[PDB]
Design a protein around this ligand. Structure first.
Ligand SMILES: C=C1[C@@]2(C)C[C@H]3[C@]4(C)CC[C@@H](O)C(C)(C)[C@H]4CC[C@]3(C)[C@]1(C(=O)OC)C(=O)[C@@](C)(O)C2=O
Ligand SMILES: O=C(O)CCC(=O)C(=O)O
Ligand SMILES: O=C(O)CCC(=O)C(=O)O
Ligand SMILES: [Fe+3]
Ligand SMILES: [Fe+3]
Lengths: 286, 295
């Protein structure tokens, strides 16, 4: 009794803070999954307050250009600006145990690190964002199709509420299993215009989406800044969009755990080394 | 010429004053090509001299496993060698060829440094397993020869490369086989049947090789010869380097670099286009070179 008997049933999008082997199976089966309450209530709140001054000084472009910057604010310096982010959120033992199932291989330590820490605020009346796979960031990955390894996953977390009206993210569950991975336009995608989305949540819930999954922010209302926190995580062989080890000051890196140092590139795992030695030695982190 | 003798595979040779289109054509055909005088004999001799203290402090590891042992590997070339940072990495032919491999229209430099490794193969050192350098990026073989390029190496003779002292063994045209497997008995059907050719070179010569080319260091069967190489390993901007150069190379040395050299070492970003434009290795919407103060 999930849809009225006889109706078309829409692509499946499971919801779940229980077993990691559990959430991981929903990820594998569908390409994405929701984690209701991924960051605590006040945590999501103290976080949003802490980055709000930074958001306040980001001007809004009104361009009708088609870009992803048309009335959408984006801001990446979350570690610099938010103590609760760098002290609490990125230390979710849930994140890591999930990242460990997507990415790490046995006896090789952490096969993952951060790509980005982005706060995305869809301004009211913002055109719906182009449909895309995140792994289009790494242009050849689509050419490996659904059988290729995972390159990227997003812990996409709501900051203000996510509604059909304010432009929450439209997901396409199961698009990680399509036979050919393509750009999503009328020229390159045959299914263009027939692609059945599902809008994605309340402040603190996150959805865990594969980089193979087609998606996009929808159209935005008259006075609702729809604000989100994207934890982009990639495998250790890939380069981050943000140069976090050169902008996050050494002070904050000294306060991080070994594993979070590895996420921001203040520590190696043999990639990102220093002539046969961990880069951590040279940085005065023993 | 040899005498109905079997003629082994051809490794094409060009002087460093040839058309970058002529050299790249060879690279595209065979997957590897020798560039003679890539570095001048005076430049390489100063380089060898400037890194030689660091090389002598490096213990030769001998092991009871015949392991990629008895090979010295040193990567702090920028810190240790003015010739390297002031002249060698400013090779225009090197950047001409990288652009033809990596750089898309309208996205600036599509490449950067993976590594800068002095590789000195010691007397008696055993040969290296046959491998492709793109095995570093483990999904890459699965795209086969149609896959884009992830990596190229400018592998320079610092001291002479001879068949006896362990000059690299290469397989021209292995970037074109229909299936890219690891080269072992389990997965490779040609295992044991693969014909290689050595990179015979004088100091300052180099070969340029695709990550798709099967190759391995040869056995050093001499008693005197420490066979010294300089490997300039260059990858796509989207891939992680093996060296964290921006974190170990001093900022004092960063400020002295040309802007394309800063990009190579991650002191400066490059802009990638997907409708959307994105700084790769950037700082919250701006080139990382602002926060660092490099203009
Ligand atoms: C240029 C962009 C790129 C190429 C990559 C992404 C990307 C790093 C992709 C992976 C994600 O986990 C996440 C949320 C961290 C985004 C953040 C925004 C940008 C940087 C981007 C953007 O800001 O557009 C002006 C885009 O929105 C987009 C969709 O179009 C892109 O595909
Ligand atoms: O803002 C959103 O809801 C989607 C974010 C996204 O997909 C992107 O910017 O790449
Ligand atoms: O030293 C050589 O000639 C081969 C080096 C090589 O192929 C490698 O280290 O990947
Ligand atoms: Fe996206
Ligand atoms: Fe190699």
């Amino acid at each position: 009794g999930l849809v009225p008997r006889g109706s078309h049933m829409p692509p499946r999008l499971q919801r779940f803070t229980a077993s990691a082997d559990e959430i991981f199976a929903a990820f594998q089966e569908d390409g994405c999954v929701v984690i209701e309450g991924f960051i605590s209530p006040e945590q999501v709140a103290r976080f949003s307050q802490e980055v709000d001054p930074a958001m306040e000084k980001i001007p809004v472009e009104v361009t009708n250009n088609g870009n992803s910057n048309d009335r959408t604010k984006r801001f990446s310096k979350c570690v610099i600006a938010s103590p609760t982010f760098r002290n609490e959120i990125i230390e979710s033992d849930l994140m890591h145990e999930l990242c460990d199932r997507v990415f790490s291989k046995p006896g090789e330590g952490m096969g993952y690190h951060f790509n980005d820490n982005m706060v995305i605020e869809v301004q009211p009346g913002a055109p719906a964002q182009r449909l895309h796979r995140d792994q289009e960031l790494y242009p050849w990955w689509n050419s490996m199709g659904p059988a290729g390894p995972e390159c990227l996953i997003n812990f996409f977390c709501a900051v203000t509420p996510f509604t059909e009206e304010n432009g929450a993210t439209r997901l396409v569950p199961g698009s990680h299993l399509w036979p050919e991975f393509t750009q999503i336009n009328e020229r390159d995608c045959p299914q263009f215009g027939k692609i059945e989305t599902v809008p994605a949540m309340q402040p603190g819930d996150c959805y865990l989406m594969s980089g193979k999954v087609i998606h996009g922010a929808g159209h935005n209302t008259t006075t609702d800044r729809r604000r989100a926190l994207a934890l982009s995580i990639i495998r250790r062989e890939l380069r981050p969009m943000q140069a976090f080890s050169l902008s996050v000051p050494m002070k904050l890196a000294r306060e991080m755990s070994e594993r979070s140092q590895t996420m921001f590139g203040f520590r190696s795992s043999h990639f990102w080394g220093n002539d046969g030695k961990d880069i951590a030695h040279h940085l005065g982190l023993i």
